[PDB]
């Protein structure tokens, strides 16, 4: 339902992270992989969404430049 959507999203997120070179930390990458697997195996939405909050938090705590306001600007500027 929306379960397949959260799960699909977790796979994209794990990708975005890998694209940011999160693999250069073995510890953090293993952590991300595990949360991703937990989401995919989640039997209830609650578990899926909580694990997803943790995983997304990895991306938000990366000062790097996922930079959100800039994506929103891109989104706004096209429709």
């Amino acid at each position: 339902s929306k379960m397949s959507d959260v799960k699909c999203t977790s796979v994209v997120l794990l990708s975005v992270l890998q694209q940011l070179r999160v693999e250069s930390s073995s510890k953090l990458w293993a952590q991300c992989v595990q949360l991703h697997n937990d989401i995919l195996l989640a039997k209830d939405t609650t578990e899926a969404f909580e694990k997803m909050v943790s995983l997304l938090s990895v991306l938000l705590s990366m000062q790097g430049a996922v930079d959100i306001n800039r994506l929103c600007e891109e989104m706004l500027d096209n429709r």
Partner: protein, 115 residues
Amino acid sequence: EDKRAKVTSAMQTMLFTMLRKLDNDALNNIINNARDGCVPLNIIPLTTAAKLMVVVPDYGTYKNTCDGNTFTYASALWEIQQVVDADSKIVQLSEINMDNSPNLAWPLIVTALRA
């Protein structure tokens, strides 16, 4: 690096679109907080007493998210353990008030345990 940057952008864009479509309270809270520069410094824990550390950019964000020793974030209550300004220097919850606020070196860092 440009084809790679174009794919990266398209992927990040789709990702946040999917996040919007999910329309989940907790994810929206941490994303919105992140847009105002309230960001977690570590992975948001799912278990009790676990340590969350997040940056609080200013007094508006602060008072929107904090009441007493309680911090509210990602759809959960967290019991504030410590606050520290940008000097690593501690800061009491009572020093954080509309009057004394401009006297502080922001951002603050709140360390807190899950309820």
